[PDB]
Write a protein that binds this ligand. Structure first.
Ligand SMILES: Cc1ccc(Cl)cc1-c1c(C(N)=O)cc(-c2ccnc(Nc3ccc(N4CCN(C)CC4)cc3)n2)n1C
Length: 282
């Protein structure tokens, strides 16, 4: 849980954005062995960036579930004047990258297994009153061809005790009330989950949510005019189309997640049971 900087050895850069993640080996016996881990760092520790990184760490440390990336600890580097987060290393990277690269390692059985696993991770988040706010396949990590886990808790908020929403952008995954009122909730996570289910069945092909919504809106639109047209389109029932080859019953689940009426969206528990019944009945 506390990792010494002198024993954390660099293996590979894994991603860069606010921060970056590297693969490292933790080798305290200095003999070229040790566990392989993923290390997240800031790229600026301001009063605010660091408070928020600390909150992200506390959030991840508080979670223990099969479909959530495992917290391992922190490293206080630069002679204890910097902070890095230590997580397990998942070899196949983001689900967005994995689907696009390994397009037939993957069939609909695997897609519905990943869908189930994401729903169960989100059920677990709900028990802690955590709203993820950035559910997308870029933020889901692949352990192996049968197991994915939710990552990136950088945007996650904790519901106040007496409220069912938090008022606070990946606009093409946002629910309409998040666009118009900055309101996030379990129900807006279910809206974003419907977009993740759409991303899975497009296999990450010109079919991405930004590409398809910009085609609907007008490809030439720029700046706030995009947001104005995306809000007006969503409020009057404009939706992403059914992906090629997607079963109607899986499109129905996306459609029900994308309800403008916040209280009529299904829960993650409803979704996991429905998806697993679909899996078990085929
Ligand atoms: C995915 C990602 C993109 C950009 C940035 Cl800044 C960070 C991350 C990220 C996060 C995160 N968002 O907190 C967590 C991780 C993470 C955690 C545990 N394991 C891994 N494994 C992993 C990550 C990426 C890969 N790649 C596989 C394909 N090549 C093209 C790119 C890198 C392979 C393995 N990543 N990553 C890479």
């Amino acid at each position: 849980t506390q990792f010494e900087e002198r024993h954390l050895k660099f293996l590979q850069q894994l991603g860069k954005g606010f921060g970056s993640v590297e693969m490292c080996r933790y080798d305290p016996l200095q003999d070229n062995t040790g566990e392989v881990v993923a290390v997240k760092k800031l790229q600026h520790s301001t009063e605010e960036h660091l408070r928020d990184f600390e909150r992200e760490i506390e959030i991840l440390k508080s979670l223990q579930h099969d479909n959530i990336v495992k917290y391992k600890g922190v490293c206080y580097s630069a002679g204890r004047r910097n902070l890095k987060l230590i997580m397990e290393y998942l070899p196949y990277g983001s689900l967005r990258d994995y689907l696009q690269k390994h397009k037939e390692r993957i069939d609909h059985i695997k897609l519905l297994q990943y869908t189930s696993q994401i729903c169960k991770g989100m059920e677990y988040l709900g028990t802690k009153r955590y709203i993820h706010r950035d559910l997308a396949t870029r933020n889901i990590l692949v352990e192996n061809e049968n197991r994915v886990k939710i990552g990136d808790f950088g945007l996650t908020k904790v519901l106040p005790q007496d409220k069912e929403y938090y008022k606070v952008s990946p606009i093409f995954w946002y629910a309409p009330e998040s666009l118009t009122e900055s309101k996030f909730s379990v129900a807006s996570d279910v809206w974003s989950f419907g977009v993740v289910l759409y991303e899975l069945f497009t296999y990450i092909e010109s079919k991405s949510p930004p590409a398809e919504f910009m085609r609907m809106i007008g490809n030439d639109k720029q700046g706030q005019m995009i947001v104005f047209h995306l809000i007006e389109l969503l409020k009057n029932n404009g939706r992403l189309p059914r992906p090629d080859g997607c079963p109607d019953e899986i499109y129905m689940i996306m459609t029900e997640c994308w309800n403008n009426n916040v209280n009529q969206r299904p829960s993650f528990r409803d979704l996991a049971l429905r998806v697993d019944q679909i899996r078990d009945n085929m």
